[PDB]
């Protein structure tokens, strides 16, 4: 996720070019200096490290675990979308689903054509 891409671009100590200009960038409702980004990219890390622990808190769908889900979301919903790089983040779903989906189809290709089955 965006924290990963922001460290990958910060892998070699430096960048202020366009690919950061897409990133988090809260508009006060545009080159980005280090300290501002390092701050905006930090309380998100805090929401993660305090969020990923409650996923197991008596289930994926626990009250306060969903509170940290919805709160991480609300933490993001003040912010805006991030650049065409984020395209691959969506692809990382499709290329999974494209595969997963396909396997179901494949299983059906193995289950549904030769023998009879109910529908």
């Amino acid at each position: 996720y965006l924290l990963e891409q922001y460290d990958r671009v910060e892998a070699e100590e430096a960048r202020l070019s366009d690919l950061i200009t897409g990133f988090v960038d809260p508009n006060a409702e545009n080159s980005i200096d280090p300290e501002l980004a390092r701050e905006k990219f930090a309380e998100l890390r805090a929401q993660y490290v305090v969020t990923r622990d409650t996923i197991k808190a008596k289930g994926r769908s626990h009250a306060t675990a969903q509170e940290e889900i919805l709160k991480l979301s609300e933490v993001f919903k003040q912010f805006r979308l991030v650049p065409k790089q984020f395209d691959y983040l969506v692809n990382s779903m499709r290329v999974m689903m494209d595969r997963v989906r396909t396997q179901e189809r494949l299983i059906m290709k193995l289950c549904v054509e030769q023998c009879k089955m109910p529908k």
């Binding site: 430096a14 960048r15 202020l16 070019s17 366009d18 690919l19």
Partner: protein
């Protein structure tokens, strides 16, 4: 940074900067995705150093070594000044021998009548005939 703004700040032009980067004479500036060479205050002062280095007389190579000096915060003012002084000496030799040449030219020319003649004594002093 904006590459034209940088080249005007240092007085150079972009292909000059690019020539110097081709010769590995500064810190590498990144590009942007569009391809704009990401210069810096680091590249600002590297380029100003590399600028005045040759106006002083340091070639592409030794001026690259000067940007090495700057990029070396471990640097030693001694060797810097020793090379400054070796340069002084080479300029001295240059001056001396250029003026020896000058003196020979002047001995040739004042020896000439300049009498719009076929009898140009200079050239026949220069040519190995007669």
């Amino acid at each position: 940074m904006n590459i034209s703004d940088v080249a005007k700040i240092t007085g150079l032009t972009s292909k000059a900067i690019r020539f110097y980067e081709e010769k590995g004479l500064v810190t590498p500036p990144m590009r942007s995705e569009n391809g704009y060479r990401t210069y810096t205050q680091q590249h600002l002062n590297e380029l100003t150093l590399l600028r005045q280095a040759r106006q002083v007389g340091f070639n592409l190579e030794e001026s690259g070594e000067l940007v090495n000096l700057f990029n070396d915060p471990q640097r030693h003012s001694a060797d810097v000044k020793r090379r400054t002084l070796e340069k002084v000496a080479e300029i001295e030799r240059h001056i001396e021998e250029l003026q020896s040449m000058r003196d020979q030219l002047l001995a040739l020319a004042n020896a000439c009548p300049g009498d719009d003649s076929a009898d140009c004594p200079i050239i026949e002093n220069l040519s190995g005939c007669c």
